[PDB]
């Protein structure tokens, strides 16, 4: 089948570089135009650039012109995007795209039919910074809950009983202030089960090389 | 620039019922009977994907349930009946002229029965308390529709500064929605004050929802 893996994405402090790779498989890559597609924060698409088949040929919004090149090495299968001069507002996820020739009914056209699973690119001055993990303690059910305040950057990771309870699980979408992001998670359990027996919130945050297990008890 | 505006911006149907999403472009994006225009299907955590390609063609799997029409700078994607994965961002896409452009997409949502949060309210730990800090949480769970009201007060008076809210998605199962409610103080105007308050109002009911505890 066609593929396209992405990769290359990462943290960069503003005016920095950062390339990004997009490696192709399943078909005859130098025969094809491809494209970067990015996704802001807010979810929206937005066109990045576009190359032909065998390279002569570039395409790109004013918003990145002359900060991002696109390339391609057709001996290696792979599609590159090279940013400098990266602002906040860059921050997005990557994708790349293949633009192919698809039949319509009286002639085709050609459109961005295949896509990679996304790179993510950041772009910010903030500090990596472990979380603050706190307990949250409070009829046939009861709610607890876990604060995971302070970290950066995303993303955190939140299980319960280290995964033995995952219905009635809410977490919440990680909020950024002063630079540092804060989230919490929700779970509920039947008031049988605690405090009887121990719920656990697990959080795990890799940038910071971070595991923590905060036991929830009463008061 | 061709500019493309999407119509609504969020959408909630009902399963088995009609969802019709509009797009409408600063300039004809057809030449000579071929359409330019493209709609893309997108789900969180997964790129996007061709559902509809040349304003009216069927993109690889994609239902006979959906169906995209319109020319010129007028055009529509339509998905009859609804169910329960359509749920999605949908964006128009024209490719007739460089910079190819997006629409602002268009969040599709299940509508069901409205339903009436289920809240709680958490003190700040006494491990948070040690650090110099104090959080006040107020988790508001499976309600719908997802628009809601959070006051806050501090020994009766409102408190806006200091208060951060977070929406999580439409749930797949049941088609809730759910949201926290943080309150950050420090530790010594925490101690200052007796009674905290987070009150949920929510078009379920006029008479709002009050959970408190007191630092006691
Ligand atoms: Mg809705």
């Known amino acids: 089948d066609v593929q396209l893996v992405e990769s290359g994405g990462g943290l960069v402090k503003p005016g920095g570089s950062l390339k990004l790779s997009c490696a192709a498989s399943?078909?005859?890559?130098?025969?094809?135009?491809m494209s970067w597609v990015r996704q802001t924060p807010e979810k929206r698409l937005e066109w990045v650039a576009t190359?032909?088949?065998?390279?002569?040929?570039?395409y790109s919004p004013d918003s990145v012109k002359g900060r991002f090149t696109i390339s391609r090495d057709n001996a290696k299968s792979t599609l590159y995007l090279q940013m400098s001069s990266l602002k906040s507002e860059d921050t997005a996820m990557f994708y790349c795209?293949?633009?192919?020739?698809?039949?319509?009914?009286?002639?085709?056209?050609?459109?961005?039919?295949?896509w990679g699973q996304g790179t993510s690119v950041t772009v910010s001055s903030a500090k990596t910074t472990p979380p603050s993990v706190y307990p949250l303690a409070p009829n046939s059910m009861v709610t607890l809950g876990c604060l995971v305040k302070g970290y950066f950057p995303e993303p955190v990771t939140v299980t319960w009983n280290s995964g033995s309870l995952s219905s009635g699980v809410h977490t919440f979408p990680a909020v950024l202030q002063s630079d540092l992001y804060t989230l919490s998670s929700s779970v509920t359990v039947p008031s049988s089960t605690w405090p009887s027996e121990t719920v656990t919130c697990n959080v795990a945050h890799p940038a910071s090389s971070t595991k923590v297990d905060k036991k929830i008890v009463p008061r | 620039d061709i500019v493309l505006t999407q119509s609504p911006d969020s959408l909630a149907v009902s399963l088995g019922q009609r969802a019709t999403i509009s797009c409408r472009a600063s300039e004809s994006v057809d030449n000579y009977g071929i359409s330019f225009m493209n709609w893309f299907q997108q789900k969180p955590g997964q790129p996007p994907k061709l559902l509809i390609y040349?304003?009216?063609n069927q993109g690889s799997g994609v239902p006979a349930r959906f169906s995209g029409s319109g020319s010129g700078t007028d055009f529509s994607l339509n998905i009859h009946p609804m169910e329960e994965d359509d749920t999605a961002m949908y964006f128009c896409?024209?490719?007739?002229?460089?910079?190819?452009?997006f629409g602002g997409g268009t969040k599709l949502e299940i509508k069901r029965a409205d339903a009436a949060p289920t809240v709680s309210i958490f003190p700040p730990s006494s491990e948070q308390l040690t650090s110099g800090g104090a959080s006040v949480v107020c988790f508001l769970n499976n309600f719908y529709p997802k628009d809601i009201n959070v006051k806050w007060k501090i020994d009766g008076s409102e408190r806006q500064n200091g208060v951060l809210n977070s929406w999580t998605d439409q749930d797949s199962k049941d088609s809730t929605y759910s949201m926290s409610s943080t309150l950050t103080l420090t530790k010594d105007e925490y101690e200052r004050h007796n009674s905290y308050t987070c009150e949920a109002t929510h078009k379920t009911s006029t008479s709002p929802i009050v959970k408190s505890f007191n630092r006691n």
């Open positions: 190359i032909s088949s065998g390279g002569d040929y570039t």
């Open positions: 040349a304003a009216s």
């Open positions: 399943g078909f005859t890559f130098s025969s094809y135009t």
């Open positions: 795209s293949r633009a192919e020739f698809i039949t319509t009914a009286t002639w085709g056209v050609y459109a961005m039919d295949y």
């Open positions: 896409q024209q490719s007739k002229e460089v910079p190819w452009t």
